[PDB]
Amino acid sequence: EAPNQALLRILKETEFKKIKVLGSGAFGTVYKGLWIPEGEKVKIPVAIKELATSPKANKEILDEAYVMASVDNPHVCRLLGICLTSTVQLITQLMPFGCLLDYVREHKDNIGSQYLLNWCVQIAKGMNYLEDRRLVHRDLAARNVLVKTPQHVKITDFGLAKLLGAEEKEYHAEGGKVPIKWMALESILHRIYTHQSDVWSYGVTVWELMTFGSKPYDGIPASEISSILEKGERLPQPPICTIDVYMIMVKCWMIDADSRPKFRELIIEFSKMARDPQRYLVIQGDERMHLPNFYRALMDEEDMDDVVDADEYLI
Numbered sequence: 188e189a190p191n192q193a194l195l196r197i198l199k200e201t202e203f204k205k206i207k208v209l210g211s212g213a214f215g216t217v218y219k220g221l222w223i224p225e226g227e228k229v230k231i232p233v234a235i236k237e238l239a240t241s242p243k244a245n246k247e248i249l250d251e252a253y254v255m256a257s258v259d260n261p262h263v264c265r266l267l268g269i270c271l272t273s274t275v276q277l278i279t280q281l282m283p284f285g286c287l288l289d290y291v292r293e294h295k296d297n298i299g300s301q302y303l304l305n306w307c308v309q310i311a312k313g314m315n316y317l318e319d320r321r322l323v324h325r326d327l328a329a330r331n332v333l334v335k336t337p338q339h340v341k342i343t344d345f346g347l348a349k350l351l352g353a354e355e356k357e358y359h360a361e362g363g364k365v366p367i368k369w370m371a372l373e374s375i376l377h378r379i380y381t382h383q384s385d386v387w388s389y390g391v392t393v394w395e396l397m398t399f400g401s402k403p404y405d406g407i408p409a410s411e412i413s414s415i416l417e418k419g420e421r422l423p424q425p426p427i428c429t430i431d432v433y434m435i436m437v438k439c440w441m442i443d444a445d446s447r448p449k450f451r452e453l454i455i456e457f458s459k460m461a462r463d464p465q466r467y468l469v470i471q472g473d474e475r476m477h478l479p480n481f482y483r484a485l486m487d488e489e490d491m492d493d494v495v496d497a498d499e500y501l502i
């Protein structure tokens with residue numbers, strides 16, 4: 188492959204001040220904070236992530252740092268730098284609105300069709316960039332999408348992300364805790380992960396957003412999910428979903444991974460829908476909903492139903 192000439196920035200403990208704890212969970216912890224770089228009249232809102240010092244807990248964080256310092260896209264979380272204290276700290280940008288799962292739940296009655304369809308375009312842009320950089324996320328879910336502003340989301344959690352060689356097209360995992368309700372059938376039965384198994388996970392992510400934060404296959408144990416998907420059974424059509432949006436989800440869940448749409452196609456599809464959002468999502472209250480010419484397929488010609496902007500047409 189090409190040389191990865193990315194720069195790993197190492198930060199002084201003194202340069203940044205913690206403020207509050209954000210989470211507890213599996214991972215490590217995660218704190219809110221401020222980063223005042225040395226001799227710069229700049230104060231950067233940051234999120235400091237750590238793990239308890241174990242040689243395995245320091246190795247896993249540095250592999251994540253490797254991935255995060257390589258990526259650079261408006262819809263992908265970037266690493267600001269690392270701090271080399273007893274316990275290694277990952278310093279990333281603060282996403283003041285938290286994760287997208289918690290946000291759809293907390294704001295269930297204020298989210299309109301324009302917002303949902305735009306997060307779908309943004310998640311597909313971030314995932315396409317990862318496909319370009321030959322990275323397989325392996326953990327795409329709504330909890331792993333952070334909110335910078337309600338109008339701007341970014342993909343996070345690279346703690347499972349795998350890079351592929353130019354003469355490599357699959358990642359064969361050996362073992363480890365895996366979220367089964369988001370996994371592709373080939374991933375559950377053969378431990379194979381491709382960008383196309385990420386497209387499956389994208390389908391469940393869109394489903395979580397469309398159901399305003401519902402749990403996929405609720406009340407159904409993990410051991411049973413592999414069978415359900417073998418029969419032909421998929422997740423239900425959400426109430427707000429027209430058959431157009433649902434057909435896209437259903438395609439992300441084909442048994443043949445090559446039949447599923449590509450992330451560049453998912454961008455085009457959700458972009459067209461975002462130009463007339465009320466034709467694709469039926470939400471009670473849409474016209475009067477807020478979260479604190481130029482944006483419709485009208486403009487000046489014929490049937491501009493298939494009009495895509497160049498920024499959405501990636502190849």
Ligand SMILES: COc1cc(N2CCC(N(C)C)CC2)c(-c2cnn(C)c2)cc1Nc1ncc(Cl)c(Nc2ccccc2P(C)(C)=O)n1
Pocket residue numbers: 209210211212214216217219234236279280281282283284285286289330331333343344
């Ligand atoms: C003010 O900023 C945040 C506030 C947060 N609220 C949401 C509302 C909550 N009330 C109303 C109950 C309080 C906590 C949260 C948050 C909450 N839950 N989660 C999962 C994240 C997150 C952020 N921002 C933020 N910016 C950057 C990163 Cl990297 C990050 N990470 C993170 C934090 C906690 C747990 C897990 C992670 P992960 C493993 C997904 O990286 N988190």
